[PDB]
UniProtKB/Swiss-Prot annotation, chain A:
Purpose: DNA-dependent RNA polymerase catalyzes the transcription of DNA into RNA using the four ribonucleoside triphosphates as substrates.
Protein family according to the UniProt entry: Belongs to the RNA polymerase beta' chain family. RpoC2 subfamily.
Source species: Synechococcus elongatus (strain ATCC 33912 / PCC 7942 / FACHB-805)
Full protein name: DNA-directed RNA polymerase subunit beta'
Assembly description: In cyanobacteria the RNAP catalytic core is composed of 2 alpha, 1 beta, 1 beta', 1 gamma and 1 omega subunit. When a sigma factor is associated with the core the holoenzyme is formed, which can initiate transcription.
Source superkingdom: Bacteria
Curated annotation (Swiss-Prot), chain B:
Free-text function comment from the UniProt entry: DNA-dependent RNA polymerase catalyzes the transcription of DNA into RNA using the four ribonucleoside triphosphates as substrates.
Gene from which the chain derives: rpoC1
Entry's family note: Belongs to the RNA polymerase beta' chain family. RpoC1 subfamily.
Protein name: DNA-directed RNA polymerase subunit gamma
Shown part of the complete sequence: 251 to 375 of 624
Organism for this UniProt entry: Synechococcus elongatus (strain ATCC 33912 / PCC 7942 / FACHB-805) (Anacystis nidulans R2)
Quaternary structure, from the entry: In cyanobacteria the RNAP catalytic core is composed of 2 alpha, 1 beta, 1 beta', 1 gamma and 1 omega subunit. When a sigma factor is associated with the core the holoenzyme is formed, which can initiate transcription.
Swiss-Prot record, chain C:
Species whose genome carries this gene: Synechococcus elongatus (strain ATCC 33912 / PCC 7942 / FACHB-805)
Disulfide cysteine pairs (residue numbers): none
Designated name of the protein: DNA-directed RNA polymerase subunit omega
Coiled-coil features, chain-numbered ranges: none
Similarity comment text for this entry: Belongs to the RNA polymerase subunit omega family.
Catalytic activity field: RNA(n) + a ribonucleoside 5'-triphosphate = RNA(n+1) + diphosphate
EC number(s) per entry: 2.7.7.6
Gene Ontology BP term (one): DNA-templated transcription
Gene responsible for this protein: rpoZ
Main enzyme class: transferase
UniProt keyword list: DNA-directed RNA polymerase, Nucleotidyltransferase, Transcription, Transferase
Amino acid sequence: AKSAPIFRNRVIDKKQLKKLIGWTFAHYGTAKTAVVADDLKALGFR
Amino acid sequence: IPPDLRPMVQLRFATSDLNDLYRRVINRNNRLARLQEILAPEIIVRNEKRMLQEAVDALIDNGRRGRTVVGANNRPLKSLSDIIEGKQGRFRQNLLGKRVDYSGRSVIVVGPNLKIHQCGLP
Amino acid sequence: DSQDLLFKAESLIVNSTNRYHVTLQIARRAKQARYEEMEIKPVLRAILEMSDELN
């Protein structure tokens, strides 16, 4: 925790998503990484 | 080998190849004993001994040394060595991998509303 | 909720330094739980208890 996310003001391809997931795992844990992945999946599908 | 490891079940009777191999061994052994009891000509006794050796060979490992003992159809009989070797052998078919209980199998479709730790089971 | 259990699980996996040892402890605890309860599911209650004990 305690690591505030950076405002990614750019286009988001697969590389950016993989980088974001890795950062989230490194800073937040494995269940917040799971939550983030589910939220991104929902947003992308919508 | 114990009889339940070479089952002779009734569907017709389905028999393991070990029964036929063992019968060959027993038949040749009994004939050899009879020949040794009646003082048969030496060539006949020697040929029977050769036959007994070949029958025991086919029992231990069919086709390793001589010709392969085929069955009713022209297929090799599965001897003792053929049981414990190969991808269909005992080790790889029943000891390192088994068919298990409490198992199912079905086609998979995509569940988009499920969570990553969940699955949809019919 | 399921999410709550997942967070508590992750919480216990860390600070244990051995995922195997802490899985064994959870199994044992849940076993005792159900045993002294037959007199929620065991593994779940076990994880809840162990998380609440980690303060």
